[PDB]
């Protein structure tokens, strides 16, 4: 229930974006913000633009969903989907189904299809590099985040409470490599993954990024990555619009204005 | 499985410690290093010191285990079966109130009289609603709930705790998103308040372990990265900031390396 808007300026142009409340940005908000700000989507996003225009903050989840649902019935990929989006779109606020694979894809799921419906890219950099330990790579690259968490809980249960698991050999084989990978990828972005994001995002294009159990709007400017600042802490700071994404550990990074000048 | 050793100097005393290999620091290495360097343990630590003394790197997991097992017969050779569980740390389960769930691995810590701590702690006065949902969970219990929530959404699955699962999950997700590096502002304060001056403990953070020490009221972690094997002047990293932006390396007698 309920999102503040924020007046922002990006490369000269005025916009209103949606802010997350305190608990972490959802995929639904990141998708909405891409649609709100991405020039390539301007035509398709008239209704969501108008929704937020009249609203010195405050748009509700239900309004945002009705809106997006209307938009999606008119998608232009010619998907025959009825207003059935009303059942689905709320799941993007939750995000609990959205499941990154350690090879850089996401598990195919309804949310991925929603991102396709709106022609909004969705990416992540939580990716094991096969040029590091190849023994790790073979064990881990085939897993998703949920798949991994499942194995790890299972492994703990085997020890703690005993196994009733059919694939216990596989659980016990893979759990150590999964645990080690988690330990080397604490912020759910690897060096290799960062170089992947930088490659795969086209110049002057927007996508939704999964990182740290939440989402954000990512943008590539002059070959450098930036994430949109949706933290309501900065609602009154128009000059705080972007955070650069130049390093995994954030040591080379800082806030930037709408025109990609350091704040 | 080949842990390198490193010659270090802590507060003027020479030691050899064990370094990480390709795979993040395990609780077994962190435990071993407390046994190697901590004055309180030095009478108990003869066999482990002896093991590492002339090995210029290459201490294997099996020799370390065998040794620790010999040591543990001292304030039962099921230790051999259990100690290797410390290498991957799969059953070491921090609770979001700062404890760990009790279990065989925690009993190993008590056997060796080595403290184990973490700072992945939710601050109840900051957010009482969230606290009421999250504080009661362990990491593994949270992972279970999140995996259950996924299966509820993807597969319309049925669980016994469903109202509870679905009630707590969004708070657990939120907490995880706001504590990316498994240390909170409040937990950092907690570590600093609880660790006694000149005491060592093993710290859980980011699915791995390290040796934590307190010098003059300030926290430091032992640098076990093999990239700094040839750097006797890089021994400790300060732990003053959750995001690391205030931290730096220190010599073994707590002088900034940069200086």
UniProtKB/Swiss-Prot annotation, chain B:
rRNA processing listed as a keyword: no
GO CC terms: cell periphery; cytoplasm; nucleus; plasma membrane
GO molecular function: cysteine-type carboxypeptidase activity; cysteine-type deubiquitinase activity; K48-linked deubiquitinase activity
Coiled coil: none
Keywords tagged on the record: Cytoplasm, Nucleus
Compartment(s) where it occurs, according to its Swiss-Prot or TrEMBL record: Cytoplasm; Nucleus
Transmembrane segments: none
Chief localisation class: cytoplasm
Miscellaneous: Present with 7620 molecules/cell in log phase SD medium.
Protein name per the record: Uncharacterized protein YGL082W
Naturally occurring in which organism (per UniProt): Saccharomyces cerevisiae (strain ATCC 204508 / S288c) (Baker's yeast)
Full protein: residues contained: 3 to 267 of 381
